[PDB]
């Protein structure tokens, strides 16, 4: 039963793997072209294997520049996750010495756990999700254009072109979905490429607070 | 005894009703799904629905789910939609500034 | 009974005319009272009073709506070409073929004075001129008119005549019209928005 | 003053202040709302404000 | 090198015509030949037609930098 749930696991795997690819971490094409049938071959079944760690990934090193920087992905099985589970995953991180970990939860988190997610370890970052939001990769959506993360040298180049200061740019709040998606630390610039009615693309720059 | 019958058992709690819309033009004589209810994230999270094309008339939800850069586009679509569905002509550059 | 029902429908509307001004006035106010400060600067950005950016280019390309001849679009290419033929129907010149047209238009637009224009627009006029090249091809094909100019029925050249002098004239005219439709710096774009939306 | 019974001239409401802004007329708005209606001259101490 | 547009905006016409008309109304010297004209502003626009007006505008940029332009040098169209 719960064939939909198995497809949900397939889809969340697909999308997180794709997201890690776009973010620049270690992802390979043979992984990205996996099918639902092959995943069924790889995985077990919803009533047989359950929600705990079966096919989650931590291979996501910073393949772009320095593999020492690495992503965890965790799949806690309980619906609501509390502070003790935070401690368990915290010691998991600390003993593994992995810098980053994406967290997905089933039915939300306890207020104490929600509180800890802002100050647990300034040396670590623990972006949080629910499977709800990862059933679709928002970049595939029509209503949202393409983004690019922009680099300090080009920051200087642009604000030289117009003779501005960075407080004179438009804004994008950190909590915004794509901001969460690329996990951008505040104080950076993102290039927005607005499609137009013609070949002329509309380029525009937006600063994250 | 009179309360439990009210309890929800299946479907989205926030939806009220949904209607299948049909078309006839020569390009295609097909169907499309139109729904009322103030929660976009739920309708997108099901099998069968081509979620990457789903569109909401109210600004706040699309901002909450797709980010402000999608809100900026929903304004302009909405204003142009209502102006023309009356039939008054306003140059688009005059509404782009407002968004 | 017919008179009573008809006067009921008359009164329904006549109540409206005053009332439908009740909300209109306060859109006209609330809008302009938040948006009358925005203005267009000499560097083609749109900035508030404190000097912050709203838009890097007004409208994306810097064209005001009071100079749009077309449907939101600065020119209607067909109209201009027909006009320019009518005022200069040079009888001395020979008519161009597909090859001469492309070579001539390349000869002119390669000059730097046109390169200063917005490239989008430059490519746009290219696309149109290619369009006219195809049609002159079809006409000469269907009638098999020889390009040498020697076929006895000279009238066969009147069918799709353009001459070089007309081509240069046409290009200079499109350059004007586009160059004189930019939102002049200092314009109160903010308040013009409000009047166009409240109206 | 206000009205023809007392020769009050005519009012240039807020709604024409807006139409005069849109044209980008900066000297005529100043002229039509200060130097003709109610210009006045005042002494200000620069030290205390 | 100067970057701003070479076309005279309409606001510039209005302000140069106003200021020069006020200068003509005082006993400032006048250099176009007058065909018996009396109104200060008809004279102002005649001096504009002949490109004699002695003014220089100073186009400010929002960073504080600027660009002088002779009134007798901009591109002028009715
Ligand atoms: Zn004092």
Q: What sign results for the dihedral spanned by CA atoms A135, A141, A143, A148?
A: positive
Chains B and E touch (3+ CB pairs under 8 A): no
To the question of whether residue D48 is assigned a binding role by annotation, the answer is yes
Tokens of C60: 């994306």
Same domain for A88 and A152: no
Q: Which phi and psi (to 5°) does residue B17 adopt?
A: -160, 160
Cβ(C108)–Cβ(C168) under 8 Å? yes
Instruction: Give pairs for B26-35: CB < 8 Å, separation 24+.
Output: none
CA D46/CA D42 separation, integer angstroms = 13
Distance between D45 CA and the closest CA of chain C, angstroms: 28
Using DSSP, state whether C24 is helix, strand or coil: helix
Instruction: From residue C110, give the alpha-carbon distance in Å to each of A102, C105, C114, C116.
Output: 55, 8, 7, 11
How far apart are the C-alpha atoms of C148 and C95, rounded to whole Å?
Answer: 10
Is A162 close to C61, i.e. CB distance below 8 A?
no
Domain with residue A5: its CATH number is 3.40.1340.10
Residues B70, A143: contact at Cβ < 8 Å?
yes
Residue A135 DSSP one-character state: G
Say whether B31 sits in a helix, a strand or coil. Answer: strand
**Residues paired with A74 in a beta bridge:** A103
Specify whether A92 is located in the same domain as A160. Answer: no
Assess whether A38 and A104 both reside in one domain: yes
A17 and A118 together in one domain? yes
CA-based Rg of chain C, rounded to a whole angstrom?
Answer: 26
As a whole number of angstroms, the distance between CA C38 and CA C60 comes to 16
Give the residue from B49, B56, B67, B37 showing the smallest Cα distance to A138: B67
Same domain as A74, residue A47: yes
Task: From A106, A136, A166, give the residue that closes a domain.
Answer: A136
Tell me the pairing of strands C39-40 and C46-47.
antiparallel
Mark which of A84, A108, A136 sits at the end of a domain.
Answer: A136
Of A111, A101, A42, A54, the C-alpha closest to A80 is A111
β-strand partners of B35: B18
Residue identified by tokens 């915290």 is A90
Q: How far is CA C183 from CA A157, C42, C55, C175, C178, in A?
A: 27, 10, 14, 16, 11
- Do A74 and A158 fall into the same domain? no
Cα Rg, chain E, nearest whole Å: 14
Q: How far is the CA of D44 from the centre of ligand 1 (A)?
A: 8
The number of beta carbons lying within 10 Å of the beta carbon of residue B24 is 8
Same domain assignment for residues A58 and A101 = yes
B-chain CB neighbours of C68 within 8 Å are: 91
Cα separation, A14 vs A134, whole angstroms: 9
Same domain, A188 and A120: no
Tokens encoding A161: 């072109």
- Name the one residue in this structure whose structure tokens are 């960073």: E63
Q: Would you tell me how many other CB atoms lie within 10 Å of the CB of residue E27?
A: 7
Task: Determine whether E47 is exposed, middle or buried from the number of CB atoms within 10 Å of its CB (0-12, 13-18, 19+).
Answer: buried
Q: How far is the CA of D41 from the centre of ligand 1 (A)?
A: 17
Which residue numbers come right before each break in chain D (C to N over 2.5 Å)?
none
With an 8 Å Cβ cutoff, is B66 touching chain A?
A: yes
What is the total count of domains within chain A? 2
Give B-chain residues touching C65 at CB under 8 angstroms.
91, 93-94
Which residues on neighbouring strands pair with residue A81, listed in sequence order?
A109
Tokens of C91: 């009888």
Q: Give the chains touching C; criterion: ≥3 Cβ pairs < 8 Å.
A: A, B, D, E
B45-73 CB burial, b ≥16 within 10 A, e <16: beeeeebeebebeeeebbbbbbbbbbbbb
Helices D14-22 and C189-198, axial angle in degrees (round to 10): 120
**CA-CA distance, C133 to A32, in Å (whole number)?**
47
Report the residue of A141, A192, A193 to disrupt the B interface, i.e. the one with the largest count of B CBs within 10 Å: A141
Token pair 């102002």 in the structure block, residue = E44
C184: chain E residues, CB-CB within 8 Å: 7, 9-11
Q: Is D19 annotated as a binding residue?
A: no
Q: Burial, B88: exposed, middle or buried (Cβ in 10 Å; 0-12, 13-18, 19+)?
A: exposed
Question: A121 and A23 share a domain?
Answer: yes
The answer to whether residue C43 neighbours chain A at the CB level (below 8 Å) is: yes
| Structure-block tokens of residue A26 | 């270690």
**Yes or no, beta carbons of A4 and B66 under 8 Å apart:** no
Torsion of CA A4, A7, A9, A13, to 10 degrees: -160
CB A102 within 8 A of CB A133: no
E-state strands within chain A: 71-74, 100-105, 128-130, 146-149, 171-172, 189-194, 202-208
- Tally Cβ neighbours within 10 Å of residue C139: 12
Distance from C40 to chain D by nearest Cα, in Å?
Answer: 11
Report the residue of C65, C68, C74 to disrupt the B interface, i.e. the one with the largest count of B CBs within 10 Å.
C65
User: Could you tell me if A162 and C51 are in contact, meaning their C-beta atoms sit under 8 angstroms apart?
Assistant: no
Query: What is each CA distance from A126 to A72, A121, C10, C11, in whole angstroms?
Result: 9, 9, 67, 66
Which residues are CB-contacts of A37 (< 8 A; sequence separation ≥ 6)?
none
d(CA C164, CA C60): 35
Q: What is the dihedral of CA E13, E16, E22, E28, to 10 degrees?
A: -130
Q: What's the alpha-carbon Rg for chain D, to the nearest Å? A: 15
Distance spanning both ends of chain B, measured CA to CA: 52
- DSSP character for C63? B
Q: What is the DSSP letter of D32?
A: I
Q: How many residues does chain A have?
A: 209
- Bridge partner list, A128: A103
Task: For strands B17-22 and B31-36, give the pairing.
Answer: antiparallel
Q: Do the chains C and E touch each other, judged by at least 3 C-beta pairs below 8 angstroms? A: yes
- Reduced to 3 states, what is the DSSP secondary structure of residue C54? strand
> The CATH number of the domain where A186 resides is what?
3.90.940.20
Across E15-75, the runs of DSSP E, i.e. the strands, are 56-60, 66-70
- Beta-bridged to residue A202, according to DSSP, are A194
For residue A62, give the nearest of A72, A47, A75, A76 by alpha carbon. A72
By the 8 A CB rule, do C117 and C74 touch? no
Tokens 């007392």 sit on residue: D6
**How many Å apart are CA E52 and CA E58, to the nearest integer?**
18
| Angle, in degrees to the nearest 10, between helices E40-49 and E10-25 | 130
Residue A79's domain comprises 1-136
Whole-angstrom CA distances from A32 to A13, A41, A192, C99 are: 10, 16, 26, 50
3 state DSSP class of E52: coil
Q: What DSSP string runs through C119-187? A: HHHHHHHHHHHHHHHHHHHHHHHHHT--TTS--S-GGGGGSS---HHHHHHHHHHHHHHHHT-B--TT-
Q: Are A182 and A149 in contact (CB under 8 A)?
A: yes
- The conformation of residue D31, written as its DSSP 8-state character, comes to I
Domain end, chosen from A136, A161, A196, is at A136
Pair D12, D36: CB distance under 8 Å: no
Structural domains of chain E, with CATH = 1-78 (3.90.940.10)
Closest chain E CA to residue C179: E7
Query: How many other CB atoms sit within 10 Å of the CB of residue D49?
Result: 5
Q: Which residues contact A14 (CB under 8 A, 6 or more apart)?
A: A34
Sequential DSSP letters for A72-116: EEE---SSSB-HHHHHHHHHHHHHHT-SEEEEEESS-B-HHHHHH
**Within a 10 A sphere around the Cβ of E51, how many other Cβ atoms?**
13
Structure tokens at B35: 């729904």
| Euclidean distance between CA atoms E18 and E30, whole angstroms | 15
What residues sit around ligand 1, an ion, with C-beta below 5 angstroms? D 45, 47-48
Q: How far apart are CA C122 and CA C164, in angstroms?
A: 19
Statement to judge: residues A153 and A78 lie in one domain: no
Q: Are strands A146-149 and A189-194 parallel, antiparallel or unpaired?
A: antiparallel
Alpha-carbon Rg for chain A in angstroms: 19
| CA torsion angle C71 C40 A197 B21 (round to 10) | -80
Nearest in space to C129 (alpha carbons), one of C68, C171, C179: C171
Assigned token pair, B55: 């569109």
- Which of helix, strand or coil describes residue C103? helix
Helix axes B59-66, B68-86, angle to 10 degrees: 150
Q: Which residues contact A61 (CB under 8 A, 6 or more apart)?
A: A25, A26, A67, A68, A69, A70, A71
Query: Is the domain of A100 the same as that of A146?
Result: no
Residues A93 and A62 in one domain: yes
């Amino acid at each position: 039963d719960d064939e939909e749930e198995t497809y949900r696991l397939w889809k969340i795997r697909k999308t997180i793997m794709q997201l890690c690819h776009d973010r620049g971490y270690l992802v390979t094409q043979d992984e990205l072209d996996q099918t639902l049938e092959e995943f069924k071959a790889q995985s077990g079944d919803k009533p047989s294997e359950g929600r705990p760690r079966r096919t989650d990934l931590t291979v996501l090193v910073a393949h772009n520049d320095d593999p020492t920087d690495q992503m965890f992905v965790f799949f806690p099985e309980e619906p609501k996750v509390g502070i003790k589970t935070i401690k368990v995953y915290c010691q998991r991180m600390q003993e593994e010495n992995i810098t980053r970990a994406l967290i997905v939860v089933q039915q939300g988190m306890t207020p104490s756990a929600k509180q800890s997610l802002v100050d647990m370890a300034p040396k670590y970052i623990l972006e949080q999700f629910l499977q709800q939001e990862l059933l679709i990769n928002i970049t595939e959506h029509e209503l949202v254009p393409e983004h690019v993360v922009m680099t300090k040298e080009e920051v200087t180049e642009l604000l030289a072109r117009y003779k501005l200061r960075e407080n004179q740019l438009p804004r994008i709040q950190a909590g915004d979905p794509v901001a969460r998606y690329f996990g951008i630390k505040r104080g950076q610039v993102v290039k927005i490429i607005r499609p137009s009615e013609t070949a002329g693309r509309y380029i525009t720059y937006r600063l994250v607070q | 005894k009179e309360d439990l019958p009210k309890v929800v058992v299946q479907g989205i709690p926030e939806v009220s009703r949904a209607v299948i819309h049909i078309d006839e033009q020569s390009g295609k004589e097909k169907y499309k799904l139109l729904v009322e209810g103030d929660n976009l994230r739920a309708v997108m999270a099901t099998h069968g629905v081509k979620g990457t094309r789903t569109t909401s008339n109210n600004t706040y939800e699309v901002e909450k789910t797709l980010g402000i850069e999608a809100a900026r586009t929903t304004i302009i679509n909405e204003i142009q939609y209502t102006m023309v569905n009356h039939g008054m002509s306003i140059d688009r550059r005059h509404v782009m500034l407002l968004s | 009974t017919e008179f009573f029902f008809h006067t009921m429908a008359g009164r329904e509307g006549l109540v409206d005319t005053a009332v439908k001004t009740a909300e209109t006035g306060y859109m006209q106010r609330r809008l302009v009272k938040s948006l009358e400060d925005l203005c267009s600067q000499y560097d083609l950005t749109v900035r508030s009073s404190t000097g912050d950016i709203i838009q890097f280019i007004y409208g994306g390309d810097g064209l005001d709506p009071a100079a749009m001849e077309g449907k939101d679009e600065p020119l209607e290419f067909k109209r201009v070409l027909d006009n320019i033929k009518a005022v200069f129907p040079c009888p001395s010149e020979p008519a161009l073929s597909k090859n001469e047209l492309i070579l001539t238009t390349e000869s002119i637009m390669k000059k730097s004075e046109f390169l200063c224009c917005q490239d989008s627009f430059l490519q746009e006029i290219k696309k149109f001129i290619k369009g006219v090249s195809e049609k002159i091809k079809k006409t000469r094909d269907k009638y098999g008119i020889n390009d040498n100019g020697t076929t006895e029925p000279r009238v066969l050249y009147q069918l799709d005549r353009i001459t070089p002098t007309q081509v240069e004239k046409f290009l200079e005219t499109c350059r004007d019209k586009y160059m004189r439709a930019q939102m002049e710096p200092g314009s109160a774009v903010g308040a013009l928005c409000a009047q166009s939306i409240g109206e | 003053t206000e009205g023809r019974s007392r020769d009050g001239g005519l009012r240039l409401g807020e709604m024409e202040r807006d139409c005069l802004i849109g044209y980008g007329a900066s000297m005529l708005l100043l002229e039509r709302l200060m130097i003709s209606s109610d210009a006045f001259e005042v002494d200000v101490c620069g030290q205390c404000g | 090198k100067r970057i701003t547009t070479p076309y005279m905006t309409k606001y510039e016409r209005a302000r140069v015509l106003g200021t020069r008309a006020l200068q003509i109304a005082m006993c400032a010297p006048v250099m176009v030949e007058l065909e018996g004209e009396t109104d200060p502003l008809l004279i102002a626009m005649k001096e504009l037609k002949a490109r004699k007006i002695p003014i220089i505008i100073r186009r400010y940029l929002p960073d504080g930098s600027y660009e002088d332009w002779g009134v007798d040098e901009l591109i002028i169209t009715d």
